[PDB]
Structure 1
Amino acid sequence: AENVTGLFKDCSKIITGLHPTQAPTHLSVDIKFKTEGLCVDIPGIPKDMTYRRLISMMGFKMNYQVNGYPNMFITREEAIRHVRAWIGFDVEGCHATRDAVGTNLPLQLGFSTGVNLVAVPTGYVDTENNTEFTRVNAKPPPGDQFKHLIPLMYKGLPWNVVRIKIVQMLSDTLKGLSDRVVFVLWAHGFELTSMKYFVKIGPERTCCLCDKRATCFSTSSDTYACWNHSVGFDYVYNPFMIDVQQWGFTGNLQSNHDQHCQVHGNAHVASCDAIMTRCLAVHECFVKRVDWSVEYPIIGDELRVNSACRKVQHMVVKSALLADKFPVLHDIGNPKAIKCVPQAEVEWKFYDAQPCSDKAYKIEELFYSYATHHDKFTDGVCLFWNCNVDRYPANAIVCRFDTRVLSNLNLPGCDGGSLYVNKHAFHTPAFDKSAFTNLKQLPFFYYSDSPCEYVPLKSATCITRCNLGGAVCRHHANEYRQYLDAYNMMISAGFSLWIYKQFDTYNLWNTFTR
């Protein structure tokens, strides 16, 4: 007897602390004051007038239940519900060599965002009057692999700066994306410890002069801040975090990351570590395919993009059917019947890896790979609409997401692929030209077969309902305008259209014969 933390372990090199007053604990008061499991005041042996004792912040170990106070560690489930509130977090650190030993200071912080913030080594030092938060002498870890940390000692930066820069850097990243923060970390101990600097915690609060829950806090003048409308805010009111390693991974992080994703090589920089942590969380959760019970609220204008997406789908597959008159259509990646063109003579076959249970009688359970299936559908046309695959067959109509475009919808992923979120987040592979080698790009066009009915405009590109004249026909002239807008919307949404090369704009004209 008895066990000790050590948390707030006294790291000073002083023998013989500490007077029973100005002693934080019974554990340290000099043996001289201790008798019979107690302490006793001896006026003769004085309390120190001046002393500086480094107190270790390591081993924070916080698990607690208080009604008004939110658990800051969350279930794997709850961590999926909020994604890209996700930020990878890892802190390289330093040891205090000179006037103290046995604690680790937070030298360099890094995030899923490319940013790295380096700080002056600082710590908490107990003194006669109070506890003070101050710069401390410190040294780099011993290893030759840690040799890269040395210069960072000098470079920067005051913590009052860093904790303010941290917020803004998180602020403009998460402003539109989420209401909160979740920290994704591999081995959580030191980052929890690092968190002590820029984080204050407490019961939930609403943004000053704003409706949404408060992410940030300001010591300057007490205030509770929104993600968007905060500025000049030092502290983060209610972060969340999840320790990936808690998930039962076998080895070290790098091994597990590199197993799946090759787009991140490793430089020991804290960021490159904090990114790797995210790939794993991403991959482990989201390369499992399309759990459909998860609802992420949307902002913004995905509904428009969603409608536009389907709208343009109908147009192109209807025409492509008209023009080249395919006997059968293989629709791959259609979990539900849902014919895009409801009425067509064509044989319509559905294929899916994860067909929806009800309405699963129509669909063949299949996983498409060009290697195996290049032979297997020779007949008619194949449709992959947002079904991302091994390179596409020569006869096809495909809509694919180009991961390279950034919009608040798509988030980084593994490897080089972006995890796309409109609803029901879909992880999609990195955009690859080689995949389209059998196809050709799809030029914009409009098709309407309808009886015809603010300034009019002439479009060379379309099949107009009437081309005999100019010919601006008030129904089409307006519909063409509205369709093109919904087409330009989804092409700006990052989607790209690819068609079999046989396809020709002309052949739609012969449908205007009589």
Structure 2
Amino acid sequence: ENVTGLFKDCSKVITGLHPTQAPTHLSVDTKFKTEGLCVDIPGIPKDMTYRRLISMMGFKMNYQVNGYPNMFITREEAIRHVRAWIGFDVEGCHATREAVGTNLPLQLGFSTGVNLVAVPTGYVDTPNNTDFSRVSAKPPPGDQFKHLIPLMYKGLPWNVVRIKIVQMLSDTLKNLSDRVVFVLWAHGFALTSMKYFVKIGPERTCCLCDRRATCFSTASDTYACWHHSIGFDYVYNPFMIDVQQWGFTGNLQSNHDLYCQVHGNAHVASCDAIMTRCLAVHECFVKRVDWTIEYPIIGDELKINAACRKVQHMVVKAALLADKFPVLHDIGNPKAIKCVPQADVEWKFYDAQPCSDKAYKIEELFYSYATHSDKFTDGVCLFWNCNVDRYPANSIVCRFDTRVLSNLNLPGCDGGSLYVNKHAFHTPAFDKSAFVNLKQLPFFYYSDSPCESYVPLKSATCITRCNLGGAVCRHHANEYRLYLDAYNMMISAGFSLWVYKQFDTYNLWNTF
């Protein structure tokens, strides 16, 4: 049929509108139509006191305009901008008394964890202009929606609500991305609610810097980014993805529960937003690591990457001098390069599948503790950023703590986390039971290089042959501070270091 529910008249008046007042041809009264046109009848005066509610349901954002960005994006662009993902859900209420036939936004929830309750407000048609005003409404007729019953008396005016939305989005995303991606399940009512707080147009620039404009103010027609959006009320040019359009059957919870167990509490807007983002992250990221997609630097990724390599070199160089194992096993190394080339030890490499390394010396190993307990009975093992069920008693382990959230460590699926440094690594949930056979590694600095020279260093953790005397030179006094900062940065990023229980520093004091 040649009708749509967009801009539907929900008023209870049995008659239509006058030809000089009806917005469309389907809105004019039947008494005026004649042979497909409308004829002015002096006997029917136009109405000057009517109020007609207009439905904002049924938007179609499929415009193709030359200088305008498109709101809906492809899945590859969403994978690129995963740092900007904010789940979004809306729970609504039904217009009841003076108008029936539309739903109004009641509780808007985001994956950040907030719920904003708004006064039921609609767009009514008056003889002068469309008026944005409060309308009578009732909660949906269902038991599942009974928790929405109090919220009808707890809403805020939309002027407050949209300013709070802009504040929350800017405070969440200003150190992560230059845009917002809304992760939706069903976009119809989400778009109907976005009509209340989202405006679009050509791409712009912030009024105080060179960043992309993300917010618009109607008090003064100015555009700003996340950093300069204080007092701004509208979201300008957002992006969105609909997850249900990825071939899903059933509802949101039935699909989320197949892959995750730590989120629940359906029909709450924030909880469903978290569920939507979790399902999207699972569908786009928990398969394998993709090195064809690269992410921009937003912080201390370079320092973390350097500090990890520095610690990995120093710990292994100290361990191979402490007890002098004749052979070691390196497990989980993507490429066949030993951490310390100068070591006089037999390196044997094992991995499930290397990162396309030409050196095929790496043996196949799909490790499991109950299966490979007798594989590495002798010699020190290395597990650097390798995630297994349990480590043996003779290992040196670096493990990332998924419970440490930061700009690099986004929330993940089923208790895991999405670590985005240069690529996106999905890490399963941290378990301390995997470290029952090990102990936490202490901090220490070690070097054998010759040295030549504001308080001088006074610490028992500087294991150097220079420190055997009563003083230490300035070269090691600076390099120890550099390694201390590197170790602090590495442990603050979320990395935990574990060593075998027999490890101690005294043997290192015997290396001189």
How much identity, in percent, do the aligned residues show?
Answer: 95
5+ residue gaps, structure 1: none
Range with bigger deviation, 234-243 or 184-193 = 184-193
Range with bigger deviation, 459-468 or 268-277 = 459-468
Range with bigger deviation, 124-133 or 286-295 = 286-295
CA distance in 1, matches of 2:102, 2:364: 57
Shift in Å, 1:29? 0.8
Shift in Å, 1:407? 2.2
CA contact (8 A) 1:331 1:350 kept: yes
List per-residue Cα deviations over 1:48-87 (Å, max 9, x = no partner).
1111111111111210111111111111111010112000
Give the 3 Å change call, closer, same or farther, for CA 140–360 of structure 1 in structure 2: farther
CA contact (8 A) 2:260 2:413 kept: yes
Give the 3 Å change call, closer, same or farther, for CA 76–343 of structure 1 in structure 2: same
Shift in Å, 1:344? 1.9
CA contact (8 A) 1:335 1:363 kept: no
Shift in Å, 1:363? 2.4
Range with bigger deviation, 105-114 or 345-354 = 345-354
CA contact (8 A) 1:458 1:470 kept: no
Range with bigger deviation, 407-416 or 163-172 = 407-416
CA contact (8 A) 1:450 1:465 kept: no
CA distance in 2, matches of 1:256, 1:351: 36
CA contact (8 A) 2:208 2:224 kept: no
Q: TM-score, normalised by structure 1?
A: 0.97
List per-residue Cα deviations over 1:434-484 (Å, max 9, x = no partner).
111111101101111222324311111231222332231232222112111
List per-residue Cα deviations over 1:355-383 (Å, max 9, x = no partner).
22242523234332223223322232221
Give the 3 Å change call, closer, same or farther, for CA 421–461 of structure 1 in structure 2: same
Give the 3 Å change call, closer, same or farther, for CA 238–51 of structure 1 in structure 2: same
SS at match of 1:172: helix
CA contact (8 A) 1:6 1:59 kept: yes
**Which residue in the other structure is 1:90 paired with?**
89
List per-residue Cα deviations over 1:290-335 (Å, max 9, x = no partner).
1011111112121111111111110001111221222332222222
Q: TM-score, normalised by structure 2?
A: 0.97
List per-residue Cα deviations over 1:403-462 (Å, max 9, x = no partner).
222321111112222211111021112222111111110110111122232431111123
CA contact (8 A) 2:106 2:120 kept: yes
Shift in Å, 1:273? 0.6
Aligned residue pairs total 511
SS at match of 1:208: coil
Shift in Å, 1:227? 0.8
CA distance in 1, matches of 2:415, 2:487: 26
CA contact (8 A) 1:331 1:384 kept: yes
CA distance in 1, matches of 2:231, 2:286: 39
Shift in Å, 1:147? 0.7
5+ residue gaps, structure 2: none
Matched ranges for 1:283-302 at <5 A? 283-302=282-301
Shift in Å, 1:123? 0.8
CA distance in 2, matches of 1:351, 1:265: 40
CA distance in 2, matches of 1:218, 1:353: 54
**Which residue in the other structure is 2:48 paired with?**
49
Tell me the C-alpha RMSD between the 2 structures.
1.4
Give the 3 Å change call, closer, same or farther, for CA 465–249 of structure 1 in structure 2: farther
CA distance in 2, matches of 1:193, 1:311: 53
CA contact (8 A) 1:216 1:236 kept: yes
Shift in Å, 1:354? 4.0
Shift in Å, 1:267? 4.5
Give the 3 Å change call, closer, same or farther, for CA 243–360 of structure 1 in structure 2: farther
SS at match of 2:241: strand
Range with bigger deviation, 11-20 or 381-390 = 381-390
- Within the alignment, does 1:251 sit opposite 2:219 as a pair? no
